[PDB]
Design a protein around this ligand. Structure first.
Ligand SMILES: [Mg+2]
Ligand SMILES: [Mg+2]
Ligand SMILES: [Mg+2]
Ligand SMILES: [Mg+2]
Ligand SMILES: [Mg+2]
Ligand SMILES: [Mg+2]
Ligand SMILES: [Mg+2]
Ligand SMILES: [Mg+2]
Lengths: 328, 328, 328, 328
């Protein structure tokens, strides 16, 4: 019901479009939406990406200049620097506009109020769910891919139309799909993954290694081979994305199935509590405060943790081992 | 003992006075103290208030220029911007002075050390306990009103005299009274109210609504009417300010008296613990740190909480209802 | 919605109506419904009110005599004496009736079974949500006001019609509204207010005073001025009833908003537990037992608590102060 | 300080005095104050005491009649029946008085509001601290005894004088002393003894017996002889009232002193908690409610406890023993 499969592409025809940043995402979106017959430009500072974009056939300007010539803009840059760029270069140029559009690929800076555009602007979001390299690898096959849509400020009653038009312009549909959501329901999701199961998985692996080594006389080389130094995990991820998460286990032994199911239903509430706590810590905006303040301080905890992680015994053992199998 | 009812007004005669800001407070204080025969000026940036003040018959200058011409100054601006104003415009002009006076209406920025004037300056405080509109509504009747006094730095042995003179000049006494206190005993009080019983009251009301609706099948319209959508509370506030807090209940039914008294003496320690915790959190200066850091981050929690509060079910129901009774 | 805005007034025309008690409500409800052209009488014992009632143009009889002449009755007396009056004077006269109506303004004595009329009677409830003095202060403007409706026993299939007719007859609609509810959903609400947030507020204020005085060396006069001796609370109640509870804070400083919101969302569960406990204690009928038993004992706890509250330090300080400001 | 040793006796001369009840107290107070030259009468119902009083030379009337003839009255009857007597016979006769006095020997019924005389009456209290026989046994020697004084309602500015006059009239001073206090400070004291150390002592004795018998094979006769069947406790009480509580132990062995002191300082907080709880339960009026409600039910708990206590194993054994030593 809340799903979309295709839509029109007329509202973007005759209008000019400007892309900010020429990294992976921006490069991909621009290279694609140029094929569908759209006047496109690029805004960026004079660096490597500037030369690359000018080589690939794109007329380039400065950001403030690119926004002047454009009726629509894509702010495809990291969430850690977008704030200053918007405050210094964009907002001034933008106060003197009449009817404009502003698209994002992440709702972090907007959902939490770090960027508050005027009311004369249509604020939208188009969030892909892919790495960026495989995207192009799928467009050559004529395939699409999934995205999320959202609207924060509607001043023309045409926002959703613009969002679906953009979605079509970048090769996401038809072939893939597009879901309608909010700026909050995207940041919340992107952050819950980085906070709940990735670190839990890593800590579980590390603890298994430490226990096996310091309580049962196991050697490091075998622990690493069993846990992650082999490619058993990539196979599982593949079978999951292809056949399903539970149907994947049918290709394993009965003993593994029994143990996995029992221990999954046994430890479900514990992780549920953690997920509740973290989702609550996010929904309120505390994590954004924490991260911004650590930025303003000089990334000391970042530094110390990056150190403690690399100087761990497991990391040294993995270094010695990878050197033995030819892996750089 | 610690109370005052009237005092002299001579030390301010012959001296020039400058008022910073022409908002709610400054406007009133200036308009009044001009009637009592005092050379008064105004300092502010060119905006609406500047036009209003130059209209009402006040000679205006730039802030830095007003302090040069003045021997006394009233810093009547919000506590959230006073710091930069003082650091940039006032302090430079102030190092090259001989004998000066500086008055505040709040001790937040001084009690916690965010503003540390020199030792060649007399630092005082005169804090009213009124809204600002009712003040003028009382001066026309020849009435006064209550204020708090305080001194942080005395370089002339005359501070208290200056403070009482100011109090008299703004029509607080005679007719009202004036209490002597500290910059700390004013911020502490102004904050304990905003941290202990206001939020507790609001949360209790919200919880009553939620419980009544989701556990006893009550309709929202009736809950809102009983709790706050009727002016029952304003009557209680009036009778409290007029006759007293306990003597107010004599006009209620015996059942209400019994229940209220029992449940008040039953839940006294719980709230006492909360009040202790918050007063301790304030006395040390942690809240100032918290608030300043949230300012430096971009008000993310402010934003998210303002959202969560308005998007609550009770707020939507109140919106639907107020629309039905004609209340805009 | 269940809401009602206007209805007919025919079923009461030709019938006679009798009002019991001539206090605030009775004096109010009777005059209005007389203005709308209804044969009305009054029942009361020979006392002060009797003289006033016979003065204002109402033909008076004894209570038992008023019900003989009446086809409808309004039992507008305190809930603490209604029981004996009903048991001695009304019920006997009422066993020998054919088709009757009985209206209440409170569902306390009926919701809990302290009054169980026969099955040959229509039992209803019309509960206003106003003080009683301001009611006429709105009827003079041609305005209405809100009420709650309920039915306990229907013997004519016309109960709701009679209830809406009454609502119209007393000037509640049109201009106000009328909600349909039960005798339980009215007593529960009237009691939850007197048990949850009023006493909590009072205890919080008292605790703030005690702490500030006995742990930070503050003077009583300043504490009283900050907390409630000033009319800050009345303005809050006004803006709440007018603009809304949350939209009210927009007129306060950002610091106050931040602190209030944080501490409200921080202490929400604590008060929720209390509200749950009290609502449960009420829904079962325990409080009715408690209150009916304290009467038979002689109101000892009532007495001792009324004493302890007035002999408190805060009360003595407030007495000394109010005497200093002219407040009687 | 708060002590008194003697005072005048004039205000009671020329006035008539009436005594209610001729039991232990009344028979004494009246008998004495007749010797000091005071017109005295008695009010009581026709029984045993009425015959005794008319025999001893006192003119007797009915209660209601005695108050008509008296300007002062002593309500010396049990606290369990005074309420009805006052409500039926006294209060009516008392509304039509001009200047009257009412004296009590206990503040239970007044401190808790079970008796609320008018404002045209002086309400006082004179509480002895003796059994009633020893009072005469000392008066025969020209000695006094101690009492407590209190005033609840003063309408002539002469109450304290009347109280001291009464004290002198009954032979309490000179020879003894008189303390000034309140009705509350007398009820609280009279009740704390009956709730804290008497029952604790009894329970400790019972537990010692039970333990010694059911865990160490001791015989009942020896346990009873050691604990209380011997009059050692009476000698302890005597030496306490005479020499002091601690100085009493000097006549015991060092081992006893050491053990007693150690275990007293070891178990002090435990009993302190109990005393706090009970004093709080009293100060609020809960015990009055409890006791007034057990009467209306029919004294069931009283009955069952009186049974359980007498049918205990300790009470039976005591029976055989007391029968063996000649003690009836
Ligand atoms: Mg991410
Ligand atoms: Mg992700
Ligand atoms: Mg404030
Ligand atoms: Mg305040
Ligand atoms: Mg009520
Ligand atoms: Mg209410
Ligand atoms: Mg006793
Ligand atoms: Mg005793």
């Amino acid at each position: 019901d809340k799903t979309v499969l295709d839509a029109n592409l007329d509202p973007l025809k005759g209008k000019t479009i400007g892309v900010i940043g020429y990294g992976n995402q921006g490069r991909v979106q621009a290279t694609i939406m140029r094929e569908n017959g759209l006047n496109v430009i690029v805004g960026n500072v004079k660096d490597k990406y500037y030369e690359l974009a000018k080589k690939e056939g794109f007329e380039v300007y400065e950001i403030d200049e690119a926004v002047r010539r454009s009726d629509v803009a894509l702010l495809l840059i990291p969430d850690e620097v977008m704030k200053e760029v918007y405050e210094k270069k964009i907002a001034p140029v933008l106060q003197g506009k009449k009817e404009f559009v502003l698209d994002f690929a992440s709702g972090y800076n907007v959902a939490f109020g770090l960027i508050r555009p005027p009311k004369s602007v249509d604020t939208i979001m188009v969030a892909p769910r892919m790495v960026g390299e495989g995207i192009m690898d799928l467009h050559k096959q004529g395939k699409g891919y999934p995205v999320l849509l959202g609207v924060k400020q509607d001043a023309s009653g045409k926002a959703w139309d613009y969002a679906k038009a953009i979605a079509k312009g970048i090769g996401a549909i038809p072939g893939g799909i597009a879901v309608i959501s909010s700026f909050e329901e995207e940041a919340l999701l992107d952050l819950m993954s980085e906070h709940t199961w990735v670190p839990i998985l890593f800590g579980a692996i590390k603890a298994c290694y430490d226990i096996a080594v310091k309580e049962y006389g196991v050697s490091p080389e075998a622990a690493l081979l069993e846990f992650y130094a082999s490619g058993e995990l990539a196979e599982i991820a593949r079978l999951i994305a292809e056949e399903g998460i539970f149907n994947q286990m049918v290709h394993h032994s009965t003993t593994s199935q029994y143990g996995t199911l029992t221990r999954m239903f046994k430890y479900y509430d514990v992780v549920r509590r953690i997920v509740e706590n973290e989702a609550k810590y996010i929904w309120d905006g505390s994590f954004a405060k924490e991260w911004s303040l650590e930025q303003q301080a000089g990334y000391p905890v970042f530094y110390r943790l990056w150190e403690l992680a690399t100087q761990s015994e497991m990391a040294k053992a993995e270094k010695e081992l990878y050197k033995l199998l030819g892996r750089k």
